[PDB]
Amino acid sequence: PQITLWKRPLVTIRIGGQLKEALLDTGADDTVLEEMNLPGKWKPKMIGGVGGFIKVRQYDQIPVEICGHKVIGTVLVGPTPVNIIGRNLLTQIGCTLNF
Amino acid sequence: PQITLWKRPLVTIRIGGQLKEALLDTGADDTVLEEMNLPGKWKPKMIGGVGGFIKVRQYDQIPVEICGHKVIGTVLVGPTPVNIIGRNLLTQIGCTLNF
Numbered sequence: 001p002q003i004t005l006w007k008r009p010l011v012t013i014r015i016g017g018q019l020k021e022a023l024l025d026t027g028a029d030d031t032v033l034e035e036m037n038l039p040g041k042w043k044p045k046m047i048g049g050v051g052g053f054i055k056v057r058q059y060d061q062i063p064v065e066i067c068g069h070k071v072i073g074t075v076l077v078g079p080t081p082v083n084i085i086g087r088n089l090l091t092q093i094g095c096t097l098n099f
Numbered sequence: 100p101q102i103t104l105w106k107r108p109l110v111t112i113r114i115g116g117q118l119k120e121a122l123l124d125t126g127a128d129d130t131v132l133e134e135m136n137l138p139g140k141w142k143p144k145m146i147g148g149v150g151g152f153i154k155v156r157q158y159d160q161i162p163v164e165i166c167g168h169k170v171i172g173t174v175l176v177g178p179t180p181v182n183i184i185g186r187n188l189l190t191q192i193g194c195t196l197n198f
């Protein structure tokens with residue numbers, strides 16, 4: 001689709017078997033999801049935004065479905081206030097910004 | 100133009116007479132710039148991101164030059180780690196996400 005920005009650009013994703021709403025976020029390097037119990041190997045990481053840093057669990061090579069696009073990559077899990085789809089996955093769905 | 104997301108979508112803006120680099124940020128409701136002087140009336144606001152909230156100066160009706168496009172809207176100034184162009188101004192340049 002072509003998504004305008006008058007409202008937040010929210011999409012449905014599926015990850016670890018669960019459906020979620022997430023924000024398509026060109027300002028995010030990495031995808032970051034709210035706290036959930038994902039199985040798999042992970043390593044700790046700190047990410048910085050407005051307000052400072054959060055500790056996240058970094059899971060590599062995770063399958064995610066985003067509006068019908070089946071992708072595989074890194075997902076960070078921790079205390080973000082909103083589920084965010086970052087550039088690492090935006091590039092896999094072929095997302096561009098146009099003006 | 101159409102901007103891919105392999106790299107951060109960084110652009111040159113002009114605000115208050117000065118050239119700056121900024122991030123085109125679809126996950127930001129609002130435009131937030133690093134501490135700077137700016138003429139005009141302002142009022143204090145809190146804005147919230149990953150890590151918590153920061154206190155900013157809200158200036159309304161500020162002209163911003165973005166990639167050759169002159170727009171006018173709200174600019175928040177404060178201790179953000181990066182200059183971020185949010186939807187309030189992305190909409191003014193006709194920006195969309197496409198995939």
Ligand SMILES: CC(C)CN(C[C@@H](O)[C@H](Cc1ccccc1)NC(=O)O[C@H]1CO[C@H]2OCC[C@H]21)S(=O)(=O)c1ccc(N)cc1
Pocket residue numbers: 025026027028029030031032047048049050081082084086122124125126127128129130131146147148149181183185
């Ligand atoms: C500040 C950016 C350089 C990076 N941020 C992404 C950004 O799009 C967040 C994404 C975001 C969105 C909502 C809540 C938290 C974070 N937006 C944000 O801080 O916007 C603020 C300014 O306008 C307001 O509207 C939304 C919050 C305010 S970030 O969330 O901190 C972030 C940082 C690193 C990664 N990997 C993923 C996300």
